[PDB]
Amino acid sequence: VLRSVNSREPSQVIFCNRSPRVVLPVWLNFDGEPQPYPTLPPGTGRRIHSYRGHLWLFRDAGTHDGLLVNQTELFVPSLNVDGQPIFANITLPVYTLKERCLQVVRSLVKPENYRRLDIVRSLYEDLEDHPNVQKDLERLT
Amino acid sequence: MYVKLISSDGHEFIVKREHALTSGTIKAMLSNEVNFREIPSHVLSKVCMYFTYKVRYTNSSTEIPEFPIAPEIALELLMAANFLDC
Amino acid sequence: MDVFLMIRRHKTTIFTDAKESSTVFELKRIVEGILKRPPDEQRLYKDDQLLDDGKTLGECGFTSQTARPQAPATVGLAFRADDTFEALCIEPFSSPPELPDVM
């Protein structure tokens, strides 16, 4: 269902990473499969060639944590006016304190050891319930 | 308008009422002081800092910084966030 | 510009914000509203330094980029019990436990 429209109309975009994370751009291809693209270090930008109606989202390349692009989940390149590129401001969401806590705990404890942690069962599930693109694609649909 | 949040070790954190209502658990404990027998001061100070952070950066175009969490307090802060639903 | 502060005395900590251009005295009015003690019974501090009523929080080193929402600056507070001021005493927060083995 969620897939890029095969418009064939070029659209230039600036991917601008105003997050402190390494950014993984993900293009949803014509059959809805996520295609990973080269990464952007923190604070960097790239002028890229995409197309009108194509779908993109952005993640942390290491952890797959979700990121926002122009304040939302999905970015769809639009028509270029006066030959100016479309800006895609990639930023950190305001994570819930819980989700932030989970990120930091995931970054310190190998997935083998989550069960050794002295916490309630549902938090162990929350830790193992990694941010995952496939899961988010189902939701958005 | 303020409310008082009291840590397990007796520290009294005084924050805006609207900030503390970020937490559904705190709303329910209020509906204006709340005692937290399981949350020590080094965790509840951070919780209060998250309120300030959340309120300041929710719906804002100005670039958003990372909310910092020392490794030493992360496990306890997780448990507190799960309890407080925030 | 907003600055984000923790005003602290003994085991009391007030989270609030003020303007960089606001004065020390004005911060005491804020404390007065919350703890019910007038400015003349309050001393405010940056670390060990006593702050003068007429100075701006900015002049006294509380700037927007150091007194941040997620990491607020600390302002010490002491009260006069009747005739003379108590000494500045800020109780430290509790110590985190040892990192578990896995961490």
Ligand SMILES: CC(=O)N1C[C@H](O)C[C@H]1C(=O)N1C[C@H](O)C[C@H]1C(=O)NCc1ccc(-c2scnc2C)cc1
């Ligand atoms: C026919 C068509 O549209 N295709 C066939 C390609 O297999 C994928 C797609 C295509 O050309 N796309 C999909 C997206 O709309 C972007 C566009 C594309 O691949 N442009 C080339 C490109 C190369 C590198 C990068 C990136 S992303 C981060 N750094 C770089 C250099 C972005 C775009």
